Design a binder for this molecule. Sequence first.
Ligand SMILES: Nc1ncnc2c1ncn2[C@@H]1O[C@H](COP(=O)(O)OP(=O)(O)OP(=O)(O)O)[C@@H](O)[C@H]1O
Ligand SMILES: [Mg+2]
Lengths: 70, 52, 52, 74
Amino acid sequence: IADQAVSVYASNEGYMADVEVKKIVDFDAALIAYFRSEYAPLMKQIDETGDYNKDIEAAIKAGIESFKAT
Amino acid sequence: DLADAQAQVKQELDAAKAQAAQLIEQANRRAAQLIEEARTQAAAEGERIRQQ
Amino acid sequence: DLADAQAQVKQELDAAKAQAAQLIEQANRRAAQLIEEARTQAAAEGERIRQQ
Amino acid sequence: QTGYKSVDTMIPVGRGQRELIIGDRQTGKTAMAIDAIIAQKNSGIKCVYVAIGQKQSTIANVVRKLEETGAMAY
Ligand SMILES: Nc1ncnc2c1ncn2[C@@H]1O[C@H](COP(=O)(O)OP(=O)(O)OP(=O)(O)O)[C@@H](O)[C@H]1O
Ligand SMILES: [Mg+2]
């Protein structure tokens, strides 16, 4: 669930209207790797529940900035 | 101005080295984890094949 | 002013090294998956030996 | 869950809903349902499919894929 969750988050946050057209999907997959490596407890927790909390999206955007840095 | 220019040259050189280090470490860790997980996956696939 | 430009060129140049690292990762992943397929067909041959 | 982004998001499908899939030949009509089924592996829900007047080659392809997944146990 977190996969498409973070994808749509990035889209709505305009986090995609900024990066390369073709590189979109590459960024996506590398983002999945980035997070499920670093944030594996985070996505585990969120997908085990299906509920969202604001601090969760805070962690999400933190990961957003960290991966955009990478 | 010349003294300040050399100072900022060194200041940016150090940052360039640091960022190169960060990139080279991060990418290598990601690739290594990639390889690890691929090996585990295909091994498990092999045992499943033999169960078949 | 000339001194100011060269620093930017070096910083721009690091980008090339970052791109180069990616080639390493790509070649290594291709090798890893080729190895994966080779041992896949090897497991296939072992299963064939089971068939005999 | 359908194991998709396009599907699961823009077109929700819940338990018990009927939803036709329509398209042309070799355009990706079954592969979608197959993925959906494989998704249900962990869920443990009841899943069952019927082949209706198609080529046995296609049949055995589907089969071999399923047992490859090991899905053909639930
Ligand atoms: N996500 C995908 N990416 C690339 N190719 C895909 C994808 N999904 C399905 N396909 C391809 O679509 C091709 C055509 O679909 P498929 O042959 O599986 O059944 P179909 O669309 O229902 O057609 P038919 O009328 O023969 O039953 C398949 O060979 C499959 O590899
Ligand atoms: Mg079909």
